[PDB]
Design a protein around this ligand. Structure first.
Ligand code: NDP
Ligand code: NDP
Lengths: 520, 518
């Protein structure tokens, strides 16, 4: 009933001054009169902290048992984007699909192909020979198109490819290959966040058009030995794994795993100097701001395109100043490198919180390259800009506000899932460079903001329970204290979530969440 | 529970209470606050534990269903004193109504197990004797050459042994009348007869073979009470501990007795408190507790008096908690001396802890042993009961044992003596005088559960209670103004299998723990 009070009395017996005085934020010599107040606060907070512990999840990778060899010869269409890919790689893949039955039919995509044009190429290849599946390589094409700077050209291509299979009425599994979009074990250092976008989108493609969608596979850095053979068997798995990574140690499948925090944490995180929240005048940024003020940030810099013009801006400066912090509210687009650069240097910021972003529910079929740009630009490109600046092990915190939409997905959330899966890989890439980064993909928050709409209705109806802001904050604190990289923090009603989520499409994604097992 | 208090005290936000519960000031560092918390919490915890040491005896309505029997012969054993021929005649007729035929043995006074064996030998060849029904426990008057010991109980014993020397292996059923209190307004209460239950419960364990059970008849034999008597003797469902009342047949059950707040009053002495056997182990603790809660004075008595180990040492502690102390050489069984003591010290609160403890199989037991074990405990209580005729007296407390409630191997005499105490207290209550009987499991420390004897009870499932918490329980019982309560820490999973080792029992069916050990 009360594990907090449990642990307290278990510390009281045991006589752990160290644990208790840490817990209460007090010195061994503190008077009872300071001790009592600190107790009631710890008590309210510990009970919410224990609640929030059960909201944590991480992404693991589990070994998938080899089960080949098998089958007779099929034709696959191999789709190759205009950039990002070495001929030597196409040949090695082609040659390894051949040595396992799969005959290859190569389609080369022109730059900025439309869904109309691709459906034509698909219609032609479909009639020619008997195509069983499509192996798309287009996600390796990271460069933006110059017309549309904020979208990687291969992700524009994936999109138009999912739509083109529709326009063509083509009912044929699409498989999406990436190299470095996931971290599947310690030792992965090829991390390519623009390619993670394929995974964020792909999970949604899988829900919206299960019939069009084979799966996602991540190739390793080193393609020596047998990895390319394992590719061939991965494409045929018949275990219905649809999120795979191929490594030195074989084929690995993506799982979501409860990640309860094993105590204690190795620090109590506090901002030193200035803290920056981009999108700091939104619902979530306002909370993050109140928290920083409460825990003694000397200055909070809040940015947004509207800046001081933003509804609530003057309320919020008042509240923050009433808690003793200095406040700077600036109008600044995240995507503007010079303005952000001047900004960081002027205030000497020591902690960055990236909350700039837009939410919109929009089916993949209704999404185009501009919509994708509209949704991604501040989140993704604001994250690169921040990453480029901040070339610095000194920073206390480089915290990205991501979403469950980017970790497991949901209908309507192609572009948003893409933008969010980028951040999780960006955070991993940064760590691999020796920099700090933290990416937290939230379930919805109570209060205003992105989960407040009829949108909040949709998400409640899918079995995501909004988290009280104060408990969300407590969980952020915890992540920061724990010095974590990626962790997902959501209050999910598994009874209701799973049946909705797995209506159209089976998934092994949640096999390791007990409450999710129960729910069919 | 405590905790729930603490957390709201903490919640918002009160130094005063928290500061008071822990002996320390608003200024105290956290490194003193910790230890103080652990000690508060540990005390509060032990309070809960000592709450779960409580049991009482209830009596459950059990209509016997087994009619079904046929016809046979019982021996019916009748003492010299305490029986109306009218009674013997009602019982003979009821036993004959239900198929049982009746052979009457009148037993000479002071009959030895030897003499008894003979007549039993004679009865057993002359007739196919199926059971034996003793009425001897009715004979309450003391043994001819043995003031300290009721005739009927010396007979019962000698009877148990007698079956021994004639290896008859036929069951003995013992009838009492008013030995037990089976519901409110049972007012015929006969402590000498209760001794039969204490010994009997032990006889059942030491000689299952030889033991039928115990049945208590009511005041008035009208309506069906004589009918039901026949039923109870041939119910056999075990059930060997039985009362018969206007409202049916009742079986004896041991039942957890959690304190059911509030606690009516907060008890303290108003004058001199006397503890008989006050220089024994338990005497010393209780005395420390009294002296602790503000007794003007404390009289400790004992045959040894001042020449007992702990002599002045004990007194020093007491004087030094701020008490007056009179250690007197006094024999509780001595009426004259005891009268003088209570007048002399205007004593308004009594705690009877004089007793004697040994483990002794029934077969090694005789009148003299029965007298050594009982004299102080029983005649002591009697003497204290005779004096102390005032409702003014705040306490009247009897230090009894679980050996008298459920029994154990080797504690026949001891069980008899304690059983006497429980019933006595009920009798005083019935007469409008205060009285309290607590039947303790074993205490940690010196005294009766100290030596080999503590080890013995250890193996049997009795966990010795820290003196300090036994005191917690005592205090509660007085505050609660209760009459009879058992207080013991029983490790049931060990207790049940060794207790019910040779003989089944229904006595614990109402203890949740006890049932998960069969
Ligand atoms: N609310 C929730 O439950 C969840 C939110 N999140 C994430 O948390 C973040 C905050 O969401 P929430 O607070 O709910 O949303 P809000 O819509 O309230 O705030 C987001 C803010 O981002 C700012 N922004 C947009 N574009 C830019 C830009 N180009 N440069 C700088 N700032 C910009 C916007 O302000 P302006 O227009 O003035 O520039 C807006 O105020 C979002 O990134 C969202 O992805 C994640 C999971 C759940
Ligand atoms: N120890 C335990 O755990 C339990 C104890 N009890 C009861 O508590 C009581 C005492 O226990 P405890 O203190 O452990 O045992 P002790 O032997 O320590 O104390 C018994 C004391 O009674 C005194 N006594 C014996 N005979 C007489 C007499 N004729 N007149 C006056 N005093 C006498 C003895 O003093 P002296 O020898 O100097 O005459 C002796 O000090 C007993 O009734 C026992 O039945 C009950 C249940 C459990």
């Amino acid at each position: 009933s009360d594990p907090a009070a449990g642990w307290f009395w278990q510390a009281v017996a045991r006589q752990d001054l160290k644990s208790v005085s840490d817990a209460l934020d007090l010195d061994a010599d503190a008077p009872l009169s300071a001790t009592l107040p600190a107790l009631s606060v710890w008590h309210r907070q510990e009970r919410e902290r224990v609640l929030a512990d059960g909201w944590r999840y991480r992404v693991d990778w589990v070994r998938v048992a080899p089960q080949p060899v098998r089958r007779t010869r099929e034709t696959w269409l191999l789709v190759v984007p205009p950039g990002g890919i070495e001929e030597a790689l196409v040949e090695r893949l082609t040659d390894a699909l051949n040595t396992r039955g799969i005959s290859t039919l190569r389609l080369d995509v022109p730059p900025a192909a439309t869904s109309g044009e691709l459906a034509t190429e698909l219609r032609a290849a479909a009639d020619g020979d008997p195509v069983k599946a499509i192996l798309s390589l287009t996600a390796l094409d990271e460069r933006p198109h110059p017309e549309c700077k904020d979208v990687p050209s291969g992700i524009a291509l994936l999109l138009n490819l999912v739509k083109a299979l529709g326009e063509a009425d083509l009912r044929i599994p699409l498989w999406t290959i990436t190299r470095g979009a996931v971290k599947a074990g310690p030792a992965d250092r090829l991390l390519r966040p623009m390619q993670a976008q394929a995974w964020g989108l792909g999970r949604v493609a899988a829900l919206e058009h299960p019939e069009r969608w084979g799966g996602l596979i991540d190739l390793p850095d080193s393609l020596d030995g047998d990895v390319l053979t394992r590719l061939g068997e991965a494409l045929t798995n018949g275990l219905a794994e649809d999120q795979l990574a191929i490594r030195q140690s074989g084929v690995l499948a993506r799982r979501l795993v409860p990640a309860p925090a094993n105590q204690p944490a190795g620090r109590k995180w506090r901002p030193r100097g200035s803290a920056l929240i981009t999108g700091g005048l939104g619902a979530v940024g306002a909370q993050v701001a109140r928290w920083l003020a409460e825990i003694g940030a000397e200055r909070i810099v809040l940015t947004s395109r509207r800046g001081n013009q933003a509804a609530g801006a003057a309320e919020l400066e008042a509240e923050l100043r009433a808690l003793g912090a200095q406040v700077s509210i600036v109008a600044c687009d995240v995507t503007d490198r010079a303005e952000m650069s001047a900004l960081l240097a002027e205030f000497d910021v020591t902690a960055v919180f990236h909350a700039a972003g837009v939410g919109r529910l929009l089916p993949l079929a209704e999404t185009d390259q501009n919509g994708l740009a509209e949704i991604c630009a501040a989140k993704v490109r604001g994250a690169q800009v921040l990453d480029e600046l901040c070339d610095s092990t000194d920073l206390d915190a480089f915290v990205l506000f991501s979403s469950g939409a980017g970790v497991w997905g949901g209908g309507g959330q192609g572009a948003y899932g893409a933008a969010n899966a980028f951040l999780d890989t960006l955070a991993e890439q940064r760590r691999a460079r020796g920099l700090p980064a933290t990416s937290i993909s939230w379930g919805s928050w109570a209060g205003g903001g992105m989960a407040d709409g009829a949108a909040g209705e949709h998400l409640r109806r899918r079995g995501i329970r909004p988290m009280p802001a104060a408990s969300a904050i407590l969980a952020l604190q915890e992540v920061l204290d724990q010095d974590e990289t990626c962790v997902s923090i959501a209050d999910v009603d598994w009874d209701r979530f799973v049946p909705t989520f797995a209506a159209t499409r089976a998934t092994r994604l949640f096999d390791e969440v007990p409450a999710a097992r129960k729910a069919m």
